[PDB]
Amino acid sequence: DTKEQRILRYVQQNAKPGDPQSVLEAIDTYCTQKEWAMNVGDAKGQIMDAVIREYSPSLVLELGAYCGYSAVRMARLLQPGARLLTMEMNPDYAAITQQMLNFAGLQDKVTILNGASQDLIPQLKKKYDVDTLDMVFLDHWKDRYLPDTLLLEKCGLLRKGTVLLADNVIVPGTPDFLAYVRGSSSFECTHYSSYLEYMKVVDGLEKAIYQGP
Ligand SMILES: C[S@@+](CC[C@H](N)C(=O)[O-])C[C@H]1O[C@@H](n2cnc3c(N)ncnc32)[C@H](O)[C@@H]1O
Ligand SMILES: O=[N+]([O-])c1cc(O)c(O)c([N+](=O)[O-])c1
Ligand SMILES: [Mg+2]
């Protein structure tokens, strides 16, 4: 099996069905202790929670679902009637995300869009009944943040007050995106400093005592 199947299995065997907080904790525990994985993680996740609670978005777009950690993190805080749309181009990952959402009981709040954001964004208004977005979470391949921001703007999906929230602007880094939005009068920016998750990296010394030939 894959790492992603192992994460899901761990959740199924250890988390409480229908309990999003339990699902999050199980993922964080497994990736902290057993296998590193590229979920946003609990430290930055707490910052996401605070931002979502401040703006109470009715319509959120996520770029990059992976195993569904951030989709569970965000969707659990949405008010009744609110929606998360999440784009994922890897169908194996999208399958895990759907199962993760099902297990957490959030499947009615979240819709998975299968495909590449650059192909899907222009289809949003028509196929998913979108006027403008209230919030966007960017966490896909880092070279796509700036071109997808420009594409969102072109497609008329941003309104005054739409909140973009971008992961990894330091590590691995998103230098073009970060320079662009900080420099542009079309964006007012705030930085929330944190730490990359799952960085308790096990290593060790081997002692090898020569016994002779
Ligand atoms: C860092 S992981 C997402 C982690 C997730 N946001 C979380 O915190 O649980 C990055 C994901 O973006 C997907 N991806 C990369 N480029 C993409 C694109 N252009 N459109 C859609 N998905 C993309 C990758 O397949 C991968 O699953
Ligand atoms: O390599 N990493 O540490 C990361 C961390 C992350 O949080 C990522 O989103 C990532 N990625 O999308 O490729 C990679
Ligand atoms: Mg990330």
Author numbering: 3 to 215
What do the authors say?
However, the lack of regioselectivity of COMT results in a mixture of 2 a and the undesired para‐methylated isovanillin 3 a, which are difficult to separate. Structural and mechanistic information suggest that the regioselectivity of COMT can be attributed to the concerted action of a “hydrophobic wall” found in the active site of the enzyme, and the substrate properties.
The WT monomer showed significantly lower re values of +31 % (1 a), +48 % (1 b), and +33 % (1 d) compared to +84 % (1 a), +59 % (1 b), +87 % (1 d) for the dimer. Unlike with monomeric WT COMT, the β7 strand exchange between the two subunits that occurs in the dimer maintains the overall Rossman fold tertiary structure; however, E199 and Y200 lie on the β6–β7 interconnecting loop, which is pulled out of the active site as a result of domain swapping, thus leading to loss of the E199–substrate interaction. The X‐ray crystal structures of dimeric Y200L and WT COMT revealed that a key residue (E199) had been flipped out of the active site. We rationalize that in the WT monomeric enzyme, E199 can form a hydrogen bond with the aldehyde group of 1 a, thereby leading to some para‐methylation, whereas in dimeric Y200L and WT COMT the absence of E199 from the active site results in the aldehyde group orientating towards the solvent, thereby leading to meta‐methylation. However, another explanation is that the hexa‐His tag that we introduced at the C‐terminus may have contributed to domain swapping and dimerization.
